[PDB]
Write a protein that binds this DNA or RNA. Structure first.
Lengths: 110, 51, 69, 92, 108, 104
RNA sequence: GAUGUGGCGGUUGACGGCGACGUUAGGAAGUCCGGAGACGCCGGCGGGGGCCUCGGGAAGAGUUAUCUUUUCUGCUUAACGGCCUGCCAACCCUGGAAACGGUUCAGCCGGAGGUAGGGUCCAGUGGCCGGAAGAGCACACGUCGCGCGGUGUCCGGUGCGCCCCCGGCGGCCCAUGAAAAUCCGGAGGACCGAGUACCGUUCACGCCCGGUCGUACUCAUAACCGCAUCAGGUCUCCAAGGUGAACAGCCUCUGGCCAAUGGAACAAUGUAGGCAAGGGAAGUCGGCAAAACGGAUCCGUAACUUCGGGAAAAGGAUUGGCU
RNA sequence: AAAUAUUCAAAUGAGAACUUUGAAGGCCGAAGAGGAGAAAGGUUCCAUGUGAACGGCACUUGCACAUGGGUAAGCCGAUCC
């Protein structure tokens, strides 16, 4: 027929991890190849939105590998963890608590 | 998947395949006499082999 | 093979190394260029000009066993 | 409007079935599910039903506890008011 | 506008089995009559005057009309079996060999 | 090989649906909407018209105010086609032009 | 796993960039915290790949009384890597909006700063280059043979097509749709930092190594299960062309059979398939099935009803070729 | 006796409606009578030999009988979880 596609390795079920995409060879023949699932977004915990400045791939790619040091991170604190506008919210909270605390303490003793 | 890979079954298949061979002519003389018409040669299409 | 380079110096430094080389001159093609096979990775230097290309082939170290093809 | 007399939601869902009394309770609580509500926090008419007993405001991201089908409840008003009054008098 | 022609020079080659291995005057003669026949008379895609000169053993037709390309390979197939039991005595190639055509086209 | 196609019959038939023809009730009708669902055609009205109007405002041939009302009318589907909208845009411009000269 | 060469770091543990963030390195003990592994189902929409459609062009094949610049067919480009590139989503900066705007299938962007202008990011994907023609494909010629020498193998177009994927949305719920190996990050800063060397050694390049077990082939009107070469049953992937909504039927491509014991007469009678003037369920326990209606467009549409429906009620008319 | 269906010439052989090759007619009609994997069977795959039994006809043919060979993985699976 039309150049046919078959389970090329073994495992003969159409699982989520064995969703496939067709590739054409230099022979001119169609076969699908095993492709790992497309990545999500790493979340920021407070907002729940995707974390900017961070490429997202399978954990195997994302660990000690061909990638350089930079690709795991953003330079700022909570680089991969919090989104950036989220980071400043906690710097603001840190500022407010310390200044308020001295005012509270002196008031109570007097 | 493989086509049940487990060694315990696999060895029995090898043994039974070897076992399912005809009786070799010569031995019928070196038994004295008694019709050595094997018996333990089975065919796959009929019966079933248990493990 | 993973890489194409344009820096003549980078190619030359690799070329002095023991590892290998092969060189292609033929028709004007994708194929033609001076190839240096380093063990894990292969750097390819495309010299566009014919005269400079011939000189590059001449520059090749005499001890190295480069394939004419 | 179009081929609509009153309104439905769930009357249209049924066909002929279920009945006039039965739709009264559930129509009120399914319009409440759809119903936009104003956040206490932002003040926008954003808030929507996240899940049963759970309400979430999309813009500010604030998640709030409430009734199953509806943002609050008559019972909720009564319970908060008595607690606040008791707290106010005792602290005095 | 300009110059647009289809200048095909017709070559006769001797290769392939199916009879003997010969040439003949008739192959180049057939080329002219059929070109005029199929192209000429039309409401449609052409409109042309056919001009011909003949070389030593090649007939060259330049026609003020259509192309000389894909179309000329297609037309030659038609000529073969309408008359004359031969043909399978030519259809070599490699290069632009066989009947070589040069397309004159209007500038755009 | 072994015999041949039958593209030639099919292509001419398709070319005879490129050129009107044979689209009375009888031959042309299987189940109701399924030939082309008509939902996409309604969306096509939204999409074609909103591109034209958006192009006009951002290039500046109409004012933003002219766009604002017209967009809402496109949602109402008061214009069913590429044309009829064309007259509406030009009419809107002309009415506002007559207003503007009166105002100054 | 070994290392050596280069580079990284004396502001001791890199800068540039308004920033978003960029890059061949750019310390990091105990500990912490997050995120990745990691998620339902349906609907429509977006983009991609392949397949389908089609013109020009370079080769071989066919029609070829007759006609047809007609018809058919090869026209291919990988994993992997370089450079470049994605809009939605998201974010940065400018700016300060009422005749308020953009905008979703749910009203959502902007009044905790929009529309608009300029950037940044996710890199599916394509491009061109590397791979890589040295390959493969189609031709010509050669037997110079277990194989010889040459070419050509290119360039466009179209969309409610088909399949699959991927994206971001929307519907659903008294239903709100796993976990771990695998694992990086940040916060943490102890401790160790040198100069003719010591520190980085998440970088590039170089050196070596990678054990254990399965791989035949059928996958079914004949290799499986029903004693069985049983018309049965048995999980999944690929899915051409027409007519047509069709992955319907029918015909055909591609792939696959031609083995359904064969011959003769072809009676009644069966079994299976059709048709019958006139009549029209009188047959029969009973309209059992044969038979008719049937698709669609337009018109027309009932007493009643939980007002959602009945409803495709009923009942009619229409339906081509071609220009 | 279901599964739309065979036929002609040649090759071989003692012997050919059925084997094999061509020619021809067809059939499944791409949710296939298709190319493969699972499960299952276990060598059935293929060569060569070949008709005692067996393929409820036939037979020189066979998924039969005899004789040989064939499954090679750092990257696919198992493994690991």
């Amino acid at each position: 027929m039309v150049q046919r596609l078959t389970y090329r390795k073994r495992h003969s079920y159409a699982t989520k991890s064995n969703q496939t995409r067709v590739v054409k060879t230099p022979g001119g023949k169609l076969v699908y190849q095993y492709t790992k699932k497309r990545a999500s977004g790493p979340k920021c915990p407070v907002t729940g939105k995707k974390i900017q400045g961070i490429p997202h791939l399978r954990p195997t790619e994302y660990k000690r590998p061909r990638l350089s040091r930079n690709r795991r991170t953003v330079n700022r604190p909570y680089g991969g963890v919090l989104s950036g506008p989220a980071v400043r919210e906690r710097i603001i909270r840190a500022f407010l608590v310390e200044e308020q605390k001295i005012v509270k303490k002196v008031l109570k003793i007097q | 998947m493989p086509s049940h890979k487990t060694f315990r079954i696999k060895q029995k298949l090898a043994k039974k395949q070897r076992q399912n061979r005809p009786i070799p002519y010569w031995i019928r003389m070196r038994t004295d006499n008694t019709i050595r018409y094997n018996a333990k040669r089975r065919h796959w299409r009929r019966t079933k082999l248990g493990f | 093979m993973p890489k194409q380079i344009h820096e003549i110096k980078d190619f030359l430094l690799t070329a002095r190394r023991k590892d290998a080389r092969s060189v292609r001159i033929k028709r004007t093609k994708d194929a033609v260029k001076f190839k240096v096979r380093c063990s894990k990775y292969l750097y390819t230097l495309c010299v566009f000009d014919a005269d400079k290309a011939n000189k590059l082939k001449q520059s090749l170290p005499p001890g190295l066993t480069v394939q004419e093809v | 409007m179009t081929k609509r007399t009153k309104k439905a939601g769930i009357v249209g869902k049924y066909g002929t079935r279920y009945g006039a009394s039965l739709r009264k309770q559930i129509k009120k609580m399914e319009v409440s599910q759809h119903s936009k509500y104003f956040c206490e926090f932002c003040g926008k008419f954003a808030v929507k039903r996240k899940a049963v007993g759970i309400w979430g405001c999309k813009d500010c991201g604030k998640v709030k506890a409430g009734g199953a089908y509806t943002m609050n409840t008559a019972s909720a008003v009564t319970v908060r008011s008595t607690i606040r009054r008791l707290r106010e008098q005792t602290e005095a | 506008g300009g110059k647009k022609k289809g200048s095909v020079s017709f070559v006769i080659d001797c290769s392939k089995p199916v009879e003997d291995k010969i040439m003949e005057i008739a192959s180049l003669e057939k080329f002219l009559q059929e070109r005029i026949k199929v192209a000429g008379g039309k409401a449609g895609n052409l409109g042309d005057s056919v001009t011909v000169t003949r070389d030593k053993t090649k007939v060259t037709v330049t026609s003020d009309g259509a192309f000389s390309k894909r179309y000329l390979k297609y037309l030659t197939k038609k000529y073969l079996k309408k008359h004359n039991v031969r043909d399978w005595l030519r259809v070599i190639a490699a290069n632009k060999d066989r009947n070589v055509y040069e397309l004159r086209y209007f500038n755009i | 090989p072994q015999k041949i196609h039958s593209r030639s019959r099919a292509r001419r038939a398709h070319e005879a649906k490129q050129k009107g023809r044979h689209s009375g009730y009888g031959k042309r009708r299987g189940t109701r909407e399924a030939r082309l669902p008509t939902k996409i055609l309604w969306m096509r009205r939204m999409r074609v018209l909103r591109r034209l109007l958006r192009k006009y405002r951002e290039a500046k041939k109409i004012d933003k105010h002219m766009y604002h009302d017209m967009y809402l009318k496109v949602k109402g589907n008061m214009f069913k086609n590429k044309r009829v909208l064309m007259e509406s845009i030009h009419k809107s411009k002309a009415e506002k032009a007559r207003e503007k000269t009166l105002s100054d």
